[PDB]
Design a protein around this ligand. Structure first.
Ligand code: NI
Ligand code: NI
Ligand code: NI
Ligand code: NI
Lengths: 294, 294, 294, 294
């Protein structure tokens, strides 16, 4: 019985759908969601913050600090994974694509890592890719130069934070391996396949097997899907020796037309994993697997 | 005996290595190389132009026109495939990555397609990707927004030119399929996998099989590799029902320490294809396969 | 939400382990187990009979008839799948392997199909293979000549019984396809991969994907595993578009050191399928999928 | 540049087609064919003998001895691989399949290995399978019990002969691995996939990749095909890190309607291997790769 690491991505930064009656928006709600996920058996909480007003995207370090302070004082333990995918948002000017439209948010390393400096989570997410992306109807470019990624990786090492290397393609996996080569990735490397995001690798078993075989043998890997692909990709990862992820960041629905809580999503995934003869890693078990000190 | 389409990529725009004693630099040399490839059995010639002085990169429409005029008046027929990968070259300013360094060459659609308007080749190459790339020691970003790609595709349709959709990932293949969906790709779609370029999909059999299975059934596909992977990837594509590509654009060497001509590379590939029980499409046969009018 | 056909293999003919306190031995117990499986949501019951005394192997048509009569009069409906793997049991004489030891049970078609004639189930299992096999510590040869298989297939057609073509290798799948070619397989063909039996194809995702791709597009397929592989292979089949099988024939344990009932195994599989966004076919739904008349 | 081991299977025991004007029939012709293959660059010769009259199947040890004596005294070196697939030929009596028809040739270990005792080749072929087989229009059963295979393996060890473990399925590969487990396979294990024989694994890239991944990492492996699949499977094996096989045993034709010599087949394969950037192992190089003493 392998112990499967389960991460709950509690809110994300995709647009708030106010028909969802319990979407975590405020830092208190987001912390509450981490605790709820923990109590349902989650190993790790993946955390974004939202504009506490509008439910819109935010990268305010003050908000991150409040979330971490709340979870840490909750009386419930869970490994914290803070998003660091922020500040890579490029909108080329159609009149001259050499130029970034003002709504772009492409910011330097020092600013990108400010929240990490303040909060010191065990893990932070790093999207090790540049590419054409889509969020809903919104088309943009994710701009993470290998130069910037190298600098980020180095900062994480310095801060004692383990990156979760988020990959959208085999090419991305190769670059992750290059980071490792270059001495920029400490201990047990962590890779996660983002599946079914446009214009990245699709959510299929074939994709998962192919990409898995490119990942270093000494690394831990995970894979996840979005919406209706969330549960299938979770089971498929478990079956292939990977770790897993669920949460409202990736899927709002328990079933067709029925909104989920984070806890419910965790409970469902846990049930599947157990029924398949495995179990879900406690936070401390996950730390041990990942070589994180207790 | 399937007829395999063989494209010879005669020069490219990678830096000129002057130890190579017959590198095609001038339009006359480049045309001569197309003819040499044709005579050796190539179906298609993939053409770049170089600064006739320096052997450096160029996208001068005047040079393209001279090459096409020369090949067309040579007395030898071959399908022409002009590069249109040009003008997507982004070098983010390290001091502010929202800004493009002056050495960047990111130009509008109308300028990108000028040479195509003048030369009217049967085929032109379109790199349907945005990503972190490497050429030698040089790291940069290829910036081809889906917006720009849609506009390009439309221009090709208008001009009666078939795009060769160059893909570096499964995600890229998905976007190609989206173009088809959107009515932006006429007739028989053409896909080609670029393998072993950093930070794209690697040159492996597994990569080729996986990506092939994402390509539409009604499409023609090719795959190629670079350097020592050129001949292996050619054979592997032939074996899997794909078309093939060789040439000095991709590999300078016939063998270890021995420089090749384009003709020699074509001859080698042709020999392999024939020995495997297949044959190399004549230009007219390739036109028929691709649904190009004669 | 695909409707997944779930077959419960209620007892089998592997040696009775009397530590299992509810193993179905008598025809009444075996019928009871079919009904229990149905009530838990099973689409189909796969039935063997046992020597009602000893719990040993049997192919007594009288026992088969009692089971079918009981299930059919139970007030609960389920599609019946009777084993017809019987009478192919060869034990070569070590002193002269051209000769069959007396303990062998290799019998003619007419005798093999007697129970089918009497019971007229909708489905019967046909092991379309000859090979070296292992049951526990017992090594033997399964002897099903293509000649015999052709004759069997023909008898099933005549009797209006759909064969479930049990396959242990890709070669076996090819022969199934040959049967179809030869007009010996009516309507929707049914294939099932037996995984992890020695010396057949192993229980891996890779095996399942590879073999699946050899199965005709118009066919229904299933895959199952033994013991600790039962639940993983069930989930993996569901994920890949196949149908599934559980039951005490294949696995005695709910968990480590804890014996299962057939109902419990069905319930577990059903829960997984539902959690993955699918559902389990009712008997009538399964009939419709398989093109069996109601 | 990997050194690829190339075996030439010079005649086999498939029915003599007398339209082939140079088919090796007599021991002198068969030896001559081994020498011809060697001179063209073959590493190994795979040898059967034929009834010197009729060109029909034979396992006469006297004939084997003459062939080996001739090759060894030829002045040309090549590794010898004698068939030991003989004596496993079962034709079940249709009137009672428990009984072997008189035309069957199922013989004991001691007789099966007589030629090996006399000739002491470096290698001998062992078909580690029982199954339904087809040769032309002839359907039969290959009967090699795991008991017999274990005894054979042991005899080879005693005689200092390396078995080439011939596999038709993944199940067969598993049993090969069991032999290794049991201490019945010395040094470097040798596996070869027989592809496209009915009713075994087909000649596809997918088959080769799948089966390759089941083979132990420390083992040498080969794969071959029949007829029109001979050259494709050779190239595909070379590309995947396997060794290769050609010869008149497997294919009579150089091209459509044109008969080949063994030398021509070797020359063609060698040319392909070299063009792909590899080379063909000399006999001594092949010995070194296989851990055979010189
Ligand atoms: Ni996130
Ligand atoms: Ni180019
Ligand atoms: Ni059964
Ligand atoms: Ni042979």
């Amino acid at each position: 019985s392998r112990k499967v690491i389960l991460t709950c991505a509690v809110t994300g930064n995709a647009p708030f759908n106010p028909k969802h009656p319990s979407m975590p928006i405020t830092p208190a709600q987001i912390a509450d969601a981490c605790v709820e996920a923990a109590k349902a058996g989650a190993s790790v909480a993946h955390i974004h913050v939202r504009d506490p007003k509008t439910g819109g995207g935010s990268r305010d370090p003050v908000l991150f600090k409040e979330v971490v302070d709340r979870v840490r004082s909750s009386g419930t333990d869970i490994v914290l994974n803070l998003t660091c995918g922020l500040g890579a948002f490029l909108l080329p000017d159609p009149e001259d694509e050499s130029k970034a439209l003002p709504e772009s948010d492409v910011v330097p390393v020092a600013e990108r890592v400010k929240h990490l400096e303040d909060c010191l989570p065990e893990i932070a997410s790093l999207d090790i890719t540049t590419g054409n992306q889509v969020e809903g109807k919104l088309e943009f470019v994710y701009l993470n130069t290998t130069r910037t990624l190298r600098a980020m990786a180095r900062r994480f090492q310095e801060l004692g934070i383990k990156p979760e290397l988020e990959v959208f393609s085999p090419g991305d996996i190769l670059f992750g391996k290059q980071l490792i080569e270059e001495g920029l990735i400490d201990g047990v490397p962590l890779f996660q396949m983002v599946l079914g995001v446009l214009w990245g690798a699709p959510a299929s078993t074939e994709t998962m097997i192919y990409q898995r075989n490119l990942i270093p043998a000494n690394a831990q890997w995970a894979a996840f899907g979005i919406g209706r692909d969330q549960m299938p990709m979770m089971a498929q990862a478990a079956l292939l020796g990977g770790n897993v992820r669920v949460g409202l960041e990736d899927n709002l629905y328990l079933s067709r037309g029925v909104f989920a809580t984070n806890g419910q999503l965790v409970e469902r995934a846990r049930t599947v994993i157990e029924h398949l003869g495995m179990s879900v890693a406690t936070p401390d078990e996950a730390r041990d697997i990942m070589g994180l000190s207790r």
